[PDB]
Design a protein around this ligand. Structure first.
Ligand SMILES: *[C@@H]1O[C@H](CO)[C@@H](O[C@@H]2O[C@H](CO)[C@@H](O[C@@H]3O[C@H](CO)[C@@H](O)[C@H](O[C@H]4O[C@H](CO)[C@@H](O)[C@H](O)[C@@H]4O)[C@@H]3O)[C@H](O)[C@H]2NC(C)=O)[C@H](O)[C@H]1NC(C)=O
Ligand SMILES: *[C@@H]1O[C@H](CO)[C@@H](O[C@@H]2O[C@H](CO)[C@@H](O[C@@H]3O[C@H](CO)[C@@H](O)[C@H](O[C@H]4O[C@H](CO)[C@@H](O)[C@H](O)[C@@H]4O)[C@@H]3O)[C@H](O)[C@H]2NC(C)=O)[C@H](O)[C@H]1NC(C)=O
Ligand SMILES: CCC(CC)O[C@@H]1C=C(C(=O)O)C[C@H](N)[C@H]1NC(C)=O
Ligand SMILES: CCC(CC)O[C@@H]1C=C(C(=O)O)C[C@H](N)[C@H]1NC(C)=O
Ligand SMILES: CCC(CC)O[C@@H]1C=C(C(=O)O)C[C@H](N)[C@H]1NC(C)=O
Ligand SMILES: CCC(CC)O[C@@H]1C=C(C(=O)O)C[C@H](N)[C@H]1NC(C)=O
Ligand SMILES: *[C@@H]1O[C@H](CO)[C@@H](O)[C@H](O)[C@H]1NC(C)=O
Ligand SMILES: *[C@@H]1O[C@H](CO)[C@@H](O)[C@H](O)[C@H]1NC(C)=O
Ligand SMILES: *[C@@H]1O[C@H](CO)[C@@H](O)[C@H](O)[C@H]1NC(C)=O
Ligand SMILES: *[C@@H]1O[C@H](CO)[C@@H](O)[C@H](O)[C@H]1NC(C)=O
Ligand SMILES: *[C@@H]1O[C@H](CO)[C@@H](O)[C@H](O)[C@H]1NC(C)=O
Ligand SMILES: *[C@@H]1O[C@H](CO)[C@@H](O)[C@H](O)[C@H]1NC(C)=O
Ligand SMILES: *[C@@H]1O[C@H](CO)[C@@H](O)[C@H](O)[C@H]1NC(C)=O
Ligand SMILES: *[C@@H]1O[C@H](CO)[C@@H](O)[C@H](O)[C@H]1NC(C)=O
Ligand SMILES: [Ca+2]
Ligand SMILES: [Ca+2]
Ligand SMILES: [Ca+2]
Ligand SMILES: [Ca+2]
Ligand SMILES: [Ca+2]
Ligand SMILES: [Ca+2]
Ligand SMILES: [Ca+2]
Ligand SMILES: [Ca+2]
Ligand SMILES: [Ca+2]
Lengths: 387, 387, 387, 387
């Protein structure tokens, strides 16, 4: 076993090839499948796994009642091989958690699981399944983290956590973790910024995170930093707004776009020079549809012009959270870090007449060969027998 | 790990010994078993696996509704150990696909999964579960492939794909793939020929494929080629017609036999000099029964005489697709490549009054010791509780 | 990996310690558990597994209907770790079979599975899951075998098969198998003897089998042989009759005991000099209860006196088949071959008012430390919801 | 593989971080989950496992009827990865048992499973799944053991067993076990003491056990011993009484506290010099709630003052058994033995109107970083559909 270098650049990509689809909700109609949300993908040098937050209950069972609720003592972080349904019969237990992150440094898995009360939550860090550290809420207001993979470079892994209001100024910290131990942290000096649920990836020995402004921005905030946690911050400038909800496309801003800025959804983007690959819902008002857009000057430019659009989920179909994940050369044999992404397909409450809320997933990887747009939706027929 | 040589000849065989039976549909009446079709077997130097195209749903669940449908965003290629039922709890995810192929080169698994719209489908190639290449539809008319194992020789794997009409002249291409990367391809110059769903096997460093003419041939077309993709084409001459539907046996043709030539079923045959082992349905008009026939001059001779017939499935029982698979000396310890075959036993629509369509499987391997004919049918009692 | 020596003697034992219990029928009431019969245990140098003949159906499902039937194309030999329920989710597929045997030579598993028509059945032999040989019925009357583990000595494995009437003189053959290949066989010259379902074990480089006389013997026939298949035959002389049905205990015979001699049940015994450990039902008329009896001169003596009796299953509880299995020094680290045994607990038809027949299992190993008698019955409550 | 040294001291700890939660009962409402009680955790140098005593039945099935019953022939010791639900599809079979213990010596698993009649029960010892020894009841009155992990030091493992009345003076023995073989035992000379269900852990090459006085003590008895079984005995002196039921906290005793002394619950404590970490229910009269208390002089001091209290389960929630388990440096890479604990959350009879009784589990590990109290209850809604 050797630790991931993380020193190569992102692979340039022209399109996205479908990588996985689990059909979790369809199968859970009869099969024993966990009620889950906040799924994400992360890979080791050997395999890729789907991580997810269970509700400690199964689909089509009475205990799925009220699962629109975000935090409870019953939620646990678990994982299974990519593309398989999250079942009690194929899932590895990771941590007790209602907010989480995970990543592999080349040697072992790091998992971060936050549980406990809203006014004093504690993140439990595990390395190879052994508790190695903890960090407790510093603002006493729902300590929370990525809900996607952390990023590793030369034996160090990095994540971002938030503590404070979800509708106003909060506090944001970056962490450097080695063998499950926090070796350094810094609080971001980001007045008037809002960071939630960051999607972080490694690129040329540094980390880039694209996050969610739940306070007053319909474009996405970003933070980038080196291994010493020296950071820069900003917002994606493109007039192709990335959050949901959001305004119709027009002239963007390199600061938070106030129009339709409140609320949001976890998302991601990949930076290539001044350009950006943007993943976003198709609807401006609800979590419906999904598309990938290549905007060659969208990181720093404010116009609403773009070069490529690829359909992922039809506008009449439910989507939800999305996040980045990468495949290192140690896994692929390539000379660059390959960008991939996943999409959570949320079914149930609040928009559908069920007693439960749960999601399935799809994932794609970036390639330079031919690709095609389509719609790969959840496909479940609601309501269920339980309702 | 070492590459399969694929340079020895096919083992001569006098009969077929039963190798596996999964009873998938019988078990799916209660258990959690995928709705599937287009199953096939492929082996590594260590194990044999059953691959299959799920419908992203389980038997006896409402989501099995309308699974007579061939192509959808929900279909996925998965695999499980041979003889086991295809379940969410024992199946490995391979690819998102409504048409597929797979094979092992001695080092890693190659999988090919085609998804996307009918007018621009994309084949995604994976090597050891990592995307290594893609190929997009070139005729914009349902890019499709074998639905059985590809064939590997000295580190190169080979497959055939079709694009264009299924009821007239189409386009057929042969591919050479190394470590999941397409290194060469050629379009077959085959006017008045039709190739669908090829069953390909290695033999003395070259590849032989026996396929399905869905246009105007009740005998089977074949294509053989060396590692450089230098090919030959023809039709099996035997008056023992191999396709379904077909006419009663009589004088055959070395070209397409037009009588009952439209439509068909995936099948296979093994060539031994001028002779051929033919696997076929027992019924000339429907997918019922199965039998193996040895015809000592059937590859090139047009008479309807044969030497050996072995019963596999009774004529009053449902059958379906069939395909070849081989076991290499690297797996068996033999000095030749052993021929085996599988049969898909289709239940449900359109011939049965259910809301669903699904199949189970049986498989056999060629031996020179004593064997016996019998009937090993699906055995499920329809309809089910869901209907 | 090294082949088992099989050259040491049986470990002397004073009693039997419970080793496993699967509770299959109890669990199958809700869980997905195969309908099975004819289970048996066999061990490798690393683990012990339960082999069994499925009916290609699950408990409490309609396809369990009529499973009193012995032979069908749907029956398959499968295996799982000892003590676990036989489920589609934890069972390895072995062979298509309605009669079977299996054993490990120290290097790989040998399995023997008989399927096909009653008038021409074929035994398929597999070594490490690869077909290595076949043997076809020679009397055209239900070729059949042990339904328990074969016996291995220095790289050779041995079994017994029967072909012919089950109610009169039949034909019995011994086989020597190396790496799945039959290298020698001999037909036993046994006029007026009847051998069915032999329980065979290795002891001092030779094989001893205790079997079932279904024709006209209420005591058990035996056959012993060396690696060259030079054999001796006889019947257990003890007045403690071992079969079921049988007469009340009295003066025995070294030939077949005609009284209540027709019919029978698979059983076993362990020979120690002139002494014998006898496992048998508690009832003389039905498959109820089970007990182990140490009879210090019972192999050759005809009296009905014994020294030790240990209860295994209460007389008011269902039992069924029983068989021997051994643990070699290569597995245990002992300087002798340890004797163990299993008992099949049959539930359902014909004695119970259900539509199905299925069994669970218990097993015990011989020790020289303290033990105790008790009753470890199936424990299921019949009928089931399916009936 | 190398033997665990067990020669380092316990890691000092300031609080407890949550390690696992299985949600077994919630999931068993639909999924196939064993009815269990008496769960416990034990680790090897590679992984941690949950052991448990099944009732040979699944939740929400009719065979769960009457599972308040403690001892039957159907109960089995099985294990699964920590945090996973105990299911037939993910559980390893260990032994037939209605009382049990297990631990890993660094090389292999030792399991101890007691079954048989109340008047002559037999403990079966297995090393790497092979029977290595047995010990039979010496008082003919329910031979019984820890219901938690045994303790290993330098290749020797240690446990405590009890035989005799559970409501008066009984007999208590300490055992030293090497490779599954009992090499030494001693009967504790403990007049007026009562020992049940000991929680034992290694510390500086010696063993410390904290147990349950079911006769006449509301504080917990303890026994400590070296590898030669030279022992000391006493009771925890703290006025913070550890058993359930118990009186309100007040002046304690270094002998058995008679007030509310009859009956009790399995529990644990960790000794640090004169101090003690006490785990106990929150209710003084029933198995409700759970908390960890640090009492700096509680081992030898009788006052009712303490320094730290951490909530684990709310007082309005069901708890049950609790036990210690440790993680050795060979597993963690630390320079000390890390203390952890588990809690059984019992649902059903006798306090709830169901036909069944079963439990789920949570576990925590000691750390010196920040922690938080909360409530992590079972969370199931009773009754179930079966009742
Ligand atoms: C998922 O959760 C939902 C929400 O809880 C749940 O729907 C609810 O079911 C309960 C129980 O049937 C309903 O509660 C009843 O409401 C009526 C008025 O509509 C009251 O009169 C009832 O109270 C009477 O009866 C009680 C019990 O005998 C007495 O204790 C009480 O004093 C009264 O006599 C009772 O409260 C509730 O109305 C619904 N809510 C909604 C929005 O439908 C649903 O059943 C859950 N689904 C599953 C599968 O668990
Ligand atoms: C397990 O198998 C058993 C045995 O087959 C099965 O019990 C049987 O169920 C069938 C179907 O209900 C019964 O068959 C009927 O018998 C009656 C006389 O009792 C006949 O009148 C019926 O025939 C009429 O209806 C048919 C269908 O419409 C017509 O085709 C026919 O011409 C007549 O009009 C019919 O044959 C049978 O009586 C029972 N047998 C016993 C012994 O109970 C059971 O249902 C199976 N269980 C499961 C779970 O599958
Ligand atoms: C508490 C702030 C946070 C970010 C805005 O809220 C989230 C919004 C979510 C959503 O918009 O779907 C669901 C989340 N599981 C949640 N996180 C937690 C810890 O509750
Ligand atoms: C589209 C042409 C093709 C070959 C004739 O049709 C097939 C016939 C099939 C059939 O005759 O059963 C079902 C197939 N799954 C299918 N392949 C795809 C891709 O839909
Ligand atoms: C056919 C002869 C044979 C031995 C008497 O009958 C058996 C009796 C059995 C029994 O007495 O329970 C059930 C068996 N599964 C069976 N074997 C086969 C192959 O059918
Ligand atoms: C027989 C004495 C013993 C300890 C007091 O009783 C126990 C109390 C238990 C309890 O208080 O919950 C349940 C146990 N499973 C049990 N142990 C056995 C073996 O039946
Ligand atoms: C990337 O990391 C590897 C491994 O340490 C190193 O050998 C290599 O020089 C680095 N590549 C570049 C371009 O710096
Ligand atoms: C087949 O390939 C093997 C491995 O390269 C080689 O050793 C052998 O000579 C070849 N056999 C023939 C007949 O060419
Ligand atoms: C099957 O599909 C048809 C067409 O939509 C629908 O009417 C019917 O309700 C479906 N059946 C089930 C059981 O869902
Ligand atoms: C097999 O492939 C290797 C690598 O390309 C090549 O060197 C060798 O000649 C090939 N063997 C044969 C028999 O063609
Ligand atoms: C048993 O077999 C072993 C392994 O071959 C051999 O070394 C040994 O001598 C044999 N033991 C006896 C008692 O013959
Ligand atoms: C503990 O045991 C290890 C392994 O034998 C040994 O190296 C070490 O010296 C011991 N530690 C102490 C403090 O005795
Ligand atoms: C539970 O056991 C009692 C006593 O035998 C019995 O009356 C009742 O029917 C059982 N309940 C179920 C659901 O089996
Ligand atoms: C550990 O056990 C070994 C083998 O018995 C022994 O030689 C050694 O002295 C022991 N170590 C300690 C620290 O006692
Ligand atoms: Ca926003
Ligand atoms: Ca732009
Ligand atoms: Ca089920
Ligand atoms: Ca045709
Ligand atoms: Ca011919
Ligand atoms: Ca008889
Ligand atoms: Ca005698
Ligand atoms: Ca007490
Ligand atoms: Ca104190």
């Amino acid at each position: 076993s050797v630790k991931l270098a993380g020193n190569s650049s992102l692979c340039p990509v022209s399109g996205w090839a479908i990588y996985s689809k689990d059909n979790s909700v369809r199968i859970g109609s009869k099969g024993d499948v966990f009620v889950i949300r906040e799924p994400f993908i992360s890979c080791s040098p050997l395999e890729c796994r789907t991580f997810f937050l269970t509700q400690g209950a199964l689909l089509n069972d009475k205990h799925s009642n009220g699962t629109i609720k975000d935090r409870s003592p019953y939620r646990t972080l678990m994982s299974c091989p990519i593309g398989e349904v999250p079942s009690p019969y194929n899932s590895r237990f990771e941590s007790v958690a209602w907010s989480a992150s995970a990543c592999h440094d080349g040697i072992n898995w790091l998992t971060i699981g936050i549980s406990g009360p809203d006014n004093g939550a504690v993140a439990v860090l595990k390395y190879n399944g052994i508790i190695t550290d903890t960090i407790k809420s510093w603002r006493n207001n729902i300590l929370r983290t990525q809900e996607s993979e952390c990023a590793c470079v030369n034996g160090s892994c990095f994540t971002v956590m938030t503590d404070g209001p979800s509708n106003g100024q909060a506090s944001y910290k970056i962490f450097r973790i080695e063998k499950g131990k926090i070796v350094k942290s810094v609080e971001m000096n980001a007045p008037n910024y809002h960071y939630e649920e960051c999607s972080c990836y490694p690129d040329s020995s540094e980390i880039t995170c694209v996050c969610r402004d739940n306070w007053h921005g319909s474009n996405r905030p970003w933070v980038s930093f080196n291994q010493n946690l020296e950071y820069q911050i900003g917002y994606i400038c493109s007039g192709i707004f990335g959050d949901n909800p959001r305004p119709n496309d027009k002239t963007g801003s390199c600061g938070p776009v106030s129009s339709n800025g409140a609320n949001g959804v976890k998302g991601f983007s990949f930076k290539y020079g001044n350009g950006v690959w943007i993943g976003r819902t198709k609807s401006i008002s609800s979590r419906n549809g999904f598309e990938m857009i290549w905007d060659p000057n969208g990181w720093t430019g404010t116009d609403n012009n773009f070069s490529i659009k690829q359909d992922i989920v039809g506008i009449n179909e439910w989507s939800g959270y999305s996040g980045s994940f990468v495949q290192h050369p140690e896994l692929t044999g390539l000379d660059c870090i390959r960008p991939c992404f996943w999409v959570e397909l949320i079914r149930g409450r609040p928009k559908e007449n069920t007693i439960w809320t749960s999601g399935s997933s799809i994932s794609f990887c970036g390639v330079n060969s031919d690709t095609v747009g389509w719609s790969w939706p959840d496909g479940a027929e609601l309501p269920f027998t339980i309702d």
